[PDB]
Design a protein around this nucleic acid. Structure first.
Ligand SMILES: [Mg+2]
Ligand SMILES: [Mg+2]
Ligand SMILES: [Mg+2]
Ligand SMILES: [Mg+2]
Ligand SMILES: [Mg+2]
Ligand SMILES: [Mg+2]
Ligand SMILES: [Mg+2]
Ligand SMILES: [Mg+2]
Ligand SMILES: [Mg+2]
Ligand SMILES: [Mg+2]
Ligand SMILES: [Mg+2]
Ligand SMILES: [Mg+2]
Ligand SMILES: [Mg+2]
Ligand SMILES: [Mg+2]
Ligand SMILES: [Mg+2]
Ligand SMILES: [Mg+2]
Ligand SMILES: [Mg+2]
Ligand SMILES: [Mg+2]
Ligand SMILES: [Mg+2]
Ligand SMILES: [Mg+2]
Ligand SMILES: [Mg+2]
Ligand SMILES: [Mg+2]
Ligand SMILES: [Mg+2]
Ligand SMILES: [Mg+2]
Lengths: 185, 43, 144, 120
RNA sequence: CUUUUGAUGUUAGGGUAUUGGCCUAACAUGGCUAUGACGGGUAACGGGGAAUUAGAGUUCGAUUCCGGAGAGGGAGCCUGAGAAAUAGCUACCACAUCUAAGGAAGGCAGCAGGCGCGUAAAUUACCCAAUUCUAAAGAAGAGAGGUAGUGACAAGAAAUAACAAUGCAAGGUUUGUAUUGGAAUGGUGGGAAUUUAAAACCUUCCCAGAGUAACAAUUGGAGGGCAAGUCUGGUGCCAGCAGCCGCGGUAAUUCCAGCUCCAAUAGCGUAUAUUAAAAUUGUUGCAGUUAAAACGCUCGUAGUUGAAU
């Protein structure tokens, strides 16, 4: 038989592919938050969009309808966890008011850029891919990673990086050292 | 009529070969470059 | 009044009229009549393989003035003779007078395309090499 | 040598004669530890005079190094292990080996039995 | 339309594991139908579902599960609790293999594999380790099943740099971009650790290990629709492009090139189908003086609709 390991599309395409304004917006987003394609943006939109849809559905139901209170509450909690809302704006009408910036902010690369670590967004991204960075014990080499506020404070260079204390341990620095040694002897 | 003329114009045109270029940037880098060209310094 | 019945128990009429009328829609008729499979060379398919019978010119529609290079081919599947326009600046000569051509639609289901009168088909492979590839030439060369 | 083994969902089981557990090997920085050392450590932990009542398996080393999960099985005595461990695991451990080339030309041989009073 | 040939019923039976025109006999003359019977078609197995939808819907559903059916085609049996079994049997038909010509056996819509058909689809692989079944039931078997192999069907993540100096640039000192040059790192190559039934991958560590980081991004476009050139040559109503409108008759922003740019990017085109776009099938929700469309007119059965209380 077929496997049961079901799989799903994470990103819908646009609809109108050469609308100018939209394109420009996308480009701006890419610039600001160091993203590789429009695909990343689309993916994040999709992520946002599902949530938004859920919120809308919840709002269609009245308060103290069981579903609304439970599912809506859960959604709100999730949003809070994600670092989308926080203290002031936790009422389910607010989770609609999320935009793409709010979501992109919580990408790991963005966070890295914010919290010193690298001079740029691009730099941060490359750092992340190059096996530096850790988010509480666990290393992580995907820049997309949506950091939750619980594990925002616990971000730094990993245990095993060259610039997190674990030898120059490179093709470069090590090679240079070797060369120096050779020169000496 | 004439199937004799099939492949006229292409044949006629002089073959100018491509040329060396600075190996282009790709993905993220390219996007960054585009952004720079459009909005950042020109804006 | 609306035209249609809007009774609560009206559903039979509503369904039935729609069922009869659907058939006025041209597209729907094209989809759901059985003559599709009968009266179509590809017989409900994307492409078809046909050996060539005649390299032939076709004079364009009046305003434009060209002789478009077609290939009258016989489908192996169906035994059907059809003209298939060959793309490229000089891609009639890239095929042989008897070559196993793989021919696709032109882009408009059955309906004919552009300057051409009644050639609904686009040869897009000869002796298993891609016509496009041959046209580019940097990619490939026709094996025989 | 700087590696702690933390031993999780440990479960005595006297239906078999074994202790099951999940098994996380924290080895910050210095990556990967061989099974033998782990076994030794386990032995040290649980008094456990002889090393080869311990069967370890499923050691995944996790992304980034530093941690490494596994499954520990610890039997009462070697006899117990012999009795209810599957042969492959035993072989891996090094208690036995039958390198028997039965194959699945065995199957062919079997189906070539039509009329038997056959050694042949 | 069904009814001699059981169509509908009643009686009596026969038969069945049991009910039953299921079959027989005898007797009624019923039964279905415009709320579509009976035919015909389906490129029809049904359903759970799939795609696509704001909401309706439209299409698809051979295909992970459930059910049905079939083992070349019909038919017939034996065994057995259970088969009208097909890696049981009998027979015929249609294919077809061996034969010393007397006979004999044979059925991949099991797994691989092959020819054919075709637009169209993988290895004659390893194993019972897991999941299960069967057994005289841990201990044996299992092409059930699993594991690899092929695999751009789909689906997910994600490299192809980054950074700092001066040089140059523009902006109200900072961003941007040409020289240098130390850091970073996968990839790729080899060992291990592990993984696994045994390997292979995954991850893991250790050696190797980028500057044109040749470890070289493509695909399709740049008149409009539609993001991007009235840039350079070639062609000259020719060749060609162009889904559509159009371009080409020596300035072609459309052909053929080169350069530059744009989009999506390890993907991007083409084709056929389908959904949306389609309030272009309209229940929501179309239109009918003149655009397609109020029956010539009235009566009228079903149909739909029906004052207040
Ligand atoms: Mg490392
Ligand atoms: Mg009778
Ligand atoms: Mg069928
Ligand atoms: Mg089905
Ligand atoms: Mg079929
Ligand atoms: Mg067959
Ligand atoms: Mg049978
Ligand atoms: Mg068989
Ligand atoms: Mg047979
Ligand atoms: Mg097969
Ligand atoms: Mg295929
Ligand atoms: Mg088993
Ligand atoms: Mg199988
Ligand atoms: Mg434009
Ligand atoms: Mg085209
Ligand atoms: Mg010109
Ligand atoms: Mg051009
Ligand atoms: Mg439609
Ligand atoms: Mg609509
Ligand atoms: Mg209309
Ligand atoms: Mg009219
Ligand atoms: Mg009238
Ligand atoms: Mg009436
Ligand atoms: Mg009333």
């Amino acid at each position: 038989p077929k496997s049961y390991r079901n799989y799903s599309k994470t990103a819908r395409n646009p609809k109108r592919p050469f609308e100018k304004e939209r394109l420009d917006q996308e480009l701006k987003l890419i610039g600001e938050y160091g993203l590789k394609n429009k695909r990343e943006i689309w993916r994040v939109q999709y992520l946002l969009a599902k949530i938004r849809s859920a919120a809308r559905y919840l709002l269609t139901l009245d308060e103290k309808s069981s579903k609304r209170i439970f599912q809506g509450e859960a959604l709100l909690r999730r949003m809070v966890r994600q670092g989308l809302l926080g203290e002031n704006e936790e009422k389910l009408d607010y989770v609609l008011g999320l935009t793409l910036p709010k979501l992109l902010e919580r990408r790991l690369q963005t966070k890295v850029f914010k919290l010193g670590l690298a001079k740029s967004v691009h730099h941060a991204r490359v750092l992340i891919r190059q096996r530096h960075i850790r988010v509480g014990k666990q290393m992580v080499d995907i820049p997309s990673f949506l950091v939750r506020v619980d594990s925002e404070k616990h971000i730094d260079f990993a245990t095993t990086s060259p610039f997190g204390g674990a030898r120059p341990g490179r093709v470069k620095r090590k090679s240079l050292k070797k060369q120096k040694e050779k020169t000496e002897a | 009529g004439s199937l004799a003329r099939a492949g006229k114009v292409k044949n006629q045109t002089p073959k100018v070969p491509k040329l060396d270029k600075k190996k282009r940037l790709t993905g993220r880098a390219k996007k960054r470059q585009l952004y720079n060209r459009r909005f950042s310094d020109n804006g | 009044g609306s035209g249609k019945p809007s009774g609560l128990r009206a559903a039979r009429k509503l369904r039935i009229r729609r069922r009869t009328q659907r058939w006025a829609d041209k597209s729907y008729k094209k989809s759901h009549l059985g003559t599709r499979w009968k009266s179509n060379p590809f017989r409900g398919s994307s492409h078809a393989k046909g050996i060539v019978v005649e390299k032939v010119a076709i004079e364009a529609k009046q305003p434009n003035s060209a002789y478009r290079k077609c290939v009258r081919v016989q489908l192996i599947k169906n035994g059907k003779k059809i003209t298939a326009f060959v793309p490229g600046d000089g891609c009639l000569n890239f095929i042989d007078e008897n070559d196993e051509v793989l021919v696709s639609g032109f882009g408009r289901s059955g309906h004919s395309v552009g300057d051409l009168p009644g050639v609904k088909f686009k040869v897009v492979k000869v002796a298993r090499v891609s016509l496009l590839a041959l046209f580019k030439e940097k990619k490939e060369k026709p094996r025989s | 040598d700087q590696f702690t083994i933390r031993v999780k969902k440990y479960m005595s089981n006297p239906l078999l004669r074994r202790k099951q557990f999940a098994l996380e090997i924290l080895h910050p920085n210095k990556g990967s530890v061989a099974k033998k050392e782990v076994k030794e450590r386990l032995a040290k932990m649980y008094k456990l005079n002889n090393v080869n009542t311990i069967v370890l398996f499923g050691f995944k080393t996790l992304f980034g190094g530093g941690r490494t999960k596994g499954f520990g099985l610890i039997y009462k005595n070697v006899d117990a292990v012999k009795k209810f461990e599957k042969k492959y695991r035993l072989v891996r451990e090094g208690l036995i080996d039958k390198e028997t080339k039965a194959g699945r030309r065995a199957s062919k041989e079997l189906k070539n039995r039509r009329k038997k009073v056959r050694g042949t």
